[PDB]
């Protein structure tokens with residue numbers, strides 16, 4: 001009579017499943033279609049969106065047709081391979097697109113993937129009609145993301161930042177690679193049919209990203225995930241900036257080996273806070289936003305900076321529930337079953353009346369969205385919160401996330417470059433205890 | 440040396456403020472400009488957006504030029520008042536717009552308002568240039584929301600739903616009011632200059648809502664609040680649906696007068712769950728989404744429905760921190776200072792290591808966004824969570840929110856109609872304790 005049991009790891013109430021003598025086991029995936037001329041940031045969008053979607057828990061994978069081409073055709077010689085009159089290479093390129101779609105079908109229908117990002121030019125109505133046919137026959141949704149930018153400064157910058165360094169241009173110098181790539185773009189210009197939501201593409205679910213996100217044309221958003229993608233694309237930018245991530249200075253609970261709580265900075269923690277102020281000053285940043293949690297130790301650290309700061313409840317350390325203010329030895333002795341369950345499944349494990357790393361991701365999502373909108377930001381937080389944010393920026397999986405090394409009195413300087421983050425570590429030469437525990 | 444104190448009500452760590460002998464006390468507001476012909480849902484957008492922004496904690500107010508006109512000109516006779524050749528009424532209408540802007544300045548610069556929604560036609564470039572001049576001179580941001588829809592079915596439906604019932608048409612029958620309103624729309628058509636983000640309005644921050652949210656043109660989103668508005672407008676719809684809100688059936692903690700915890704349904708709670716299934720069945724809904732919290736009592740209630748349901752951690756009852764599983768008598772005797780602080784400031788009060796109603800709003804925001812996207816939804820939740828959701832739908836203030844009456848074994852049936860919600864209460868004839876406590 002409505003009998004439930006609480007699952008040991010995640011602490012989820014499930015109906016008591018008294019399976020009979022013979023136990024029996026018993027929404028639609030999306031193909032995101034990238035659209036646009038080369039050097040329009042399609043791969044940049046594909047990679048960043050995939051990184052965000054995976055981090056929030058939506059299994060996402062990129063299928064880049066160019067990588068299938070590099071695999072089918074050993075070495076790249078020139079733009080001549082991309083010529084519309086190149087009958088043989090046109091057959092090869094089509095075969096590569098079809099092979100990528102085959103892997104899209106396998107990913108979405110057989111591997112538990114939810115979103116497949118089809119990263120190609122898809123510049124002709126013919127190619128897009130074929131992708132739609134493929135989606136309709138496989139019961140997949142189709143969502144188009146077109147990037148429109150004809151600014152020559154933006155095109156040249158994209159070639160210099162990520163095209164000249166491509167495996168295709170290994171034997172080329174910067175000038176030859178740039179010249180070949182401009183000719184390669186020209187191969188696509190004649191047959192390019194932009195998305196037309198006014199007449200031809202009126203019934204398609206699409207986003208037209210115009211001039212690096214200055215303007216957007218949004219047509220027929222069908223569901224939750226498409227709506228989320230659109231909101232994300234509207235919040236991200238390519239302006240140069242730095243993200244500094246650190247934990248509060250060493251606290252009294254750190255000295256006692258106690259988890260959670262709301263203890264204050266130790267004498268060393270206060271020394272780090274002074275060292276952090278000097279470090280921040282030496283960075284010579286025009287403007288800098290400072291974010292803390294609502295816990296004392298991060299606020300005391302920010303107080304040493306003499307800069308305005310904003311407290312976020314979303315940045316508060318993982319809630320250990322009944323295990324709050326206990327040492328790991330006291331957890332193992334009072335709750336041995338709980339201790340072993342966490343060690344076996346650190347990401348999904350939920351503390352009783354507490355949280356999991358999975359819960360942390362959900363509450364840090366608005367932090368991530370705001371970090372994307374901002375420029376120079378310093379986030380003073382906690383060990384588990386920091387691992388979660390770092391996993392987003394460094395594209396780390398749910399499995400590796402609870403084990404990322406985030407020592408005390410150490411600043412993680414993140415510089416967005418090419419298709420990810422350059423990470424520099426800066427230890428501020430103040431002693432502390434070690435709170436890192438390996439698997 | 441980084442000395443902080445925790446504020447008694449909100450539990451916020453603040454620098455110990457040792458004010459000297461003579462204590463001294465010491466971002467830009469936004470004008471949202473509605474654009475479009477009459478019967479385009481501008482007032483609908485204004486009211487709904489204001490309701491959402493206020494609920495999330497952004498002080499927002501609507502300034503409807505027509506209400507200033509109804510105040511300046513006692514009785515409305517006909518569309519002749521709106522004629523472009525009506526020199527006198529054109530002077531009166533301009534004076535009303537200027538008087539509304541005067542009140543916009545006072546609201547944003549002197550009353551602590553953050554967003555002013557300027558609800559008028561603002562169909563000419565001249566009027567919009569004047570509003571921009573007003574915004575620039577007062578250091579206010581300007582964000583334009585244009586609603587474009589020329590579907591005669593949509594226009595006729597808007598006139599029938601909310602125009603014919605306007606105080607202007609009190610002495611008129613449905614046919615005369617509809618005829619007069621069509622003529623009134625025609626008065627605006629000749630001088631109407633839609634927003635042109637391509638050439639003329641390229642530097643303006645705007646959203647063009649096309650065909651009741653089927654399509655959007657988004658130009659130059661400057662900040663966080665504009666980005667949030669755009670996301671909200673993309674999630675809302677006018678499709679007919681019903682929202683059912685109720686608490687879990689009576690639990691064991693309810694019988695003991697204990698707060699929080701994760702107790703199961705009492706015998707009466709199980710009887711409500713059966714009664715709820717019968718009620719749901721009798722509603723004869725084609726499709727229905729069922730949402731619960733992750734707490735046992737709501738899941739057991741949903742289990743009785745024999746329908747698929749989704750558990751949301753965001754729907755979990757307010758966290759009472761150290762006061763969890765205690766009766767109110769035990770709270771008053773163990774924590775008398777805490778008890779009195781809560782009674783004095785129920786919305787902002789945060790339980791030690793727990794939450795406030797203010798915290799609840801922040802974590803329920805994704806619930807609200809998803810409720811907007813959906814159609815028929817049944818939310819099985821908890822007393823404080825329910826008050827928070829109800830305050831959103833019923834446009835209740837932060838001050839009234841902790842005192843809204845949400846009894847056990849009672850379904851709140853919400854039907855979106857005109858500019859809000861019709862609320863029907865359905866008691867399912869199962870006895871329970873009373874958990875309501877007045878101020």
Ligand SMILES: O=c1[nH]cnc2c1c(-c1ccccc1)cn2-c1ccc(Br)cc1
Nearest residue numbers: 039040041044149158161209212213233
């Ligand atoms: O080249 C480009 N053209 C046009 N839009 C571009 C790029 C790049 C880019 C940035 C770094 C390297 C290579 C490419 C990113 N976006 C972009 C697109 C949409 C959004 Br919303 C944000 C950024």
Ligand SMILES: O=c1[nH]cnc2c1c(-c1ccccc1)cn2-c1ccc(Br)cc1
Nearest residue numbers: 478479480483588597600648651652672
């Ligand atoms: O008449 C209309 N024309 C055009 N758009 C309209 C309406 C109404 C409406 C609904 C009920 C009563 C009166 C008006 C709402 N929206 C609307 C606008 C934008 C979004 Br995003 C969602 C709904």
Ligand SMILES: O=P(O)(O)OC[C@H]1O[C@](O)(CO)[C@@H](O)[C@@H]1O
Nearest residue numbers: 258259260317320382383384435
């Ligand atoms: O997930 P882990 O490795 O236990 O680390 C999280 C813990 O780290 C701390 O931030 C410091 O020990 C605790 O407050 C928190 O419980």
Ligand SMILES: O=P(O)(O)OC[C@H]1O[C@](O)(CO)[C@@H](O)[C@@H]1O
Nearest residue numbers: 697698699756759821822823874
């Ligand atoms: O804000 P109030 O009036 O104390 O009501 C919230 C309380 O109501 C309950 O849902 C039932 O008593 C408790 O779990 C919760 O603490």
